[PDB]
């Protein structure tokens, strides 16, 4: 019936079950982690099966070395323990955890987490090849390991580690049209000018949702536009111990219209900022590692408050930029900021925690 995701440690003596690999943030609440950890032998019974969640900033290396990767910066950490179960749980086990404990024996112990909404959304960036940068991101990691205490020497062989994605969602607020007008006067125009207008239909868009951009142009100068341009280039900034202002144009389209002097022209253009169109590192920001296709473009970061975002992960912001290739003398352009976000009995089926891909 319903799907359940599980991952087993290489030492299969311990395993973890989850209800969903990706967690949605509603800008005021995050759905909790509703897992359960199973150990068949209790692992000699003198150990406590801690399950730790960490949200840490990254920079430099994924190779586990020290150069730059020393910036592993745990922005949040919790240490729920399962066996012994501690006095009373934080809210009763959900029905999913109950059915998991039914399908499994008595050797399965639940664990519950809650993530404050101030934490960054799970996003990672890969510089272009080789654009002088380093890999970085904000990953959420579950480490269910059995030990006698919290500070015991955790090791991979007997500890299962799996990664969660904290995507963000906000309501489709009927905000005002994000207008963007400009008027260009020329040195030789004798008071004439090129007019230009633009406006999105909506202010917020979900992944894969096409963007519609209004265009209005009226020409008063003696210069004709040869062709126009539309792009949704991504603005990504590494605000923690770096200044890398990545500027990759994730999606662009070309369409050749012409407007002579004393001519007016208005239209609407459709664009679709999509990751799978160009699955290249390209020095752009992702919501998850680009090795698997269950990821999309990084969701635009809401500043919120709480000491802004300088130490709280990397920011990404989108805006549609359109420009006119006038015959000879200008490249007048426009910018239209917006925000992009993630769109949002029978027995159980054990899906694997392997993030499928094409390679």
């Amino acid at each position, epitope marked *: 019936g319903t799907r359940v995701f599980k991952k087993s440690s290489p030492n299969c003596k311990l395993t973890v079950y989850l209800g969903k690999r990706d967690f949605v943030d509603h800008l005021d609440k995050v759905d909790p982690v509703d897992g359960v950890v199973l150990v068949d032998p209790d692992y000699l019974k003198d150990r406590k099966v801690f399950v730790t969640l960490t949200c840490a900033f990254r920079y430099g290396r994924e190779d586990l070395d020290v150069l730059g990767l020393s910036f592993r910066k745990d922005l949040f950490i919790a240490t729920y323990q399962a066996f012994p179960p501690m006095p009373n749980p934080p*809210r*009763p*086990p959900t029905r999913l955890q109950d059915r998991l404990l039914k399908k499994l024996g008595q050797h399965a112990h639940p664990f519950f987490f809650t993530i404050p909404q101030n934490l960054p959304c799970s996003v990672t960036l890969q510089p272009g090849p080789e654009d002088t940068g380093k890999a970085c991101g904000v990953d959420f990691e579950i480490r269910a390991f059995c030990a006698k205490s919290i500070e015991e020497k955790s090791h991979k062989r007997n500890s299962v580690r799996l990664i969660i994605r904290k995507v963000q969602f906000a309501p489709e607020t009927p905000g005002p049209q994000p207008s963007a007008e400009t008027t260009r006067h020329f040195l030789m125009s004798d008071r004439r000018s090129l007019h230009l207008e633009a406006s999105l239909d909506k202010e917020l868009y979900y992944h894969g949702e096409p963007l519609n951009v209004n265009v209005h142009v009226t020409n008063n100068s003696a210069k004709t536009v040869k062709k126009i341009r539309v792009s949704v280039r991504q603005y990504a900034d590494i605000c923690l111990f770096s200044t890398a202002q990545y500027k990759c144009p994730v999606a662009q389209l070309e369409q050749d219209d012409q407007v002579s002097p004393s001519s007016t022209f208005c239209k609407v253009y459709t664009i679709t900022p999509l990751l799978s169109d160009n699955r290249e590192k390209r020095g752009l920001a992702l919501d998850g590692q680009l090795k698997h296709e269950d990821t999309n473009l990084a969701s635009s970061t809401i500043v919120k408050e709480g000491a802004n975002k300088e130490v709280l992960g990397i920011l990404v912001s989108y805006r549609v930029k359109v420009k006119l290739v006038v015959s000879r003398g200008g490249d007048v352009s426009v910018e239209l900021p917006f925000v992009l976000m993630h769109p949002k009995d029978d027995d159980i089926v054990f899906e694997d925690f392997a993030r499928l891909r094409l390679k």
Partner: antibody
Amino acid sequence: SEVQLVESGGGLVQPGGSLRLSCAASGFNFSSSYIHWVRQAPGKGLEWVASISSYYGYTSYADSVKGRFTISADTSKNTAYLQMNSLRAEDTAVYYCARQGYYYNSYMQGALDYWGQGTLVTVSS
Amino acid sequence: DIQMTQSPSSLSASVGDRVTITCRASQSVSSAVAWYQQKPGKAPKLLIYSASSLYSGVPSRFSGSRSGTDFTLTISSLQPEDFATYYCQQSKYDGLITFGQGTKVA
């Protein structure tokens, strides 16, 4: 400290009347545990009635009491009420308040660890 | 709801004997049962949970066992404490509970 589950409020009412059973709890947080009301007719086996969880607000009722009983949890007073309406002769049972256990050495699933003293609810003329 | 059956509903053994009580399930129950011992005119105390796990305040003499869809309770040695009525309970779901008719162990 010990969880002294205790209930009170039951009395005598002719059929079709109303009454509010109260279940005072202590020694544990109300949110983390389910509450079940289990009744017992005179000289008969127990019978489930209804259940509520304060944190989830998930109510459920037995078939015979599907639209006659109402169970509500008031976390402020650390108590869960069962407001009964349209009582009839068969509801002359004694009613208990029970709390599911979460862990002793495993995940006892619906074990009703702690029971109250029981309140008698007579329904007669 | 789930129909849960106990049999037989009346027994009699002497102090120091060994006793068996069987409770049957009309639907697949994933070992999610528990037995209650009710002294006359008292709140039913818990006996065992998960169909095999013991509970505090109960001597190790009680030991249930799941043998498929059926369920069963064993008492290695009957004592005066065991004069009561025993109730099998099914708890497959979260909010749904059902009890058996109970057995009067004279």
